């Protein structure tokens, strides 16, 4: 079996190991990611839906006036890819979000609402991605390269004895979140446990425990 464009000129093939898995679509890394970001799923897992669900439900502090998010849609792009390249524009699609402003009756902790105003509002234009994993931002074809960053979690990265004499190893821990401040625990050559908050002075480790509503007795009980 040979495709016609391969029947025209068959490349003589050395190599003996049978091919069991053919090469996958080489641009999957970008297309799949942007497809997840742009397409809306009936869950908060991915994309604009995830962002809206994470941040959008609005409460008016001490006002109890709420603005909530219903859904969103991507409008038809004004210009085509070639047209954007020629004129020079970002190949973007308008982002229309369906919002609902609900006003709570004064003294209605039960949830009694006065009125609901459901309106669709334009929220900027998000650049779209050409069929070949490319964005055109100002008529120029741009590519966003995937980033390789430390995964969030906990890592124990004791130095190799490069700090103090005798090559004593100092063990430390570090909690890296996706968002928020770093929480590091380290040891000193005098063999004491210290907490460090990121870009901040050292403090004794037990301070954080005490801040967590812990007494000395139960602290020693745990440790």
């Amino acid at each position: 079996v040979y495709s016609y464009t391969e029947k025209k000129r068959i490349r003589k093939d050395f190599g003996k190991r049978p091919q069991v898995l053919d090469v996958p679509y080489l641009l999957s890394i970008q297309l799949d990611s942007f497809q997840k970001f742009i397409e809306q799923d009936p869950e908060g897992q991915y994309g604009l839906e995830a962002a809206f669900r994470s941040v959008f439900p609005i409460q008016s502090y001490s006002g109890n006036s709420e603005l909530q998010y219903v859904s969103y849609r991507l409008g038809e792009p004004v210009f085509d890819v070639q047209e954007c390249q020629i004129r020079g524009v970002t190949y973007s699609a308008p982002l229309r979000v369906k919002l609902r402003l609900v006003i709570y009756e004064r003294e209605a902790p039960e949830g009694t609402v006065k009125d609901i105003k459901e309106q669709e509002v334009y929220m900027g234009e998000i650049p779209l991605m050409t069929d070949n994993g490319t964005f055109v931002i100002n008529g120029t074809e741009r590519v966003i390269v995937s980033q390789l960053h430390r995964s969030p979690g906990v890592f124990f990265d004791s130095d190799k004895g490069k700090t103090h004499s005798s090559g004593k190893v100092l063990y430390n821990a570090r909690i890296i979140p996706y968002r928020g401040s770093w929480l590091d625990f380290e040891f000193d050559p005098k063999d004491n446990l210290f907490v460090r908050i990121d870009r901040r002075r050292k403090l004794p480790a037990t301070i954080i425990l005490r801040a967590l509503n812990y007494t000395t007795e139960q602290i020693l009980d745990l440790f």
Partner: peptide, 19 residues
């Protein structure tokens, strides 16, 4: 221990910052 950040995830993070 090293993760992969693609275009979609970074765009989502920036959109959340704007939000």
């Amino acid at each position: 221990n090293r993760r992969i950040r693609s275009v979609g995830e970074m765009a989502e993070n920036q959109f959340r910052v704007g939000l």
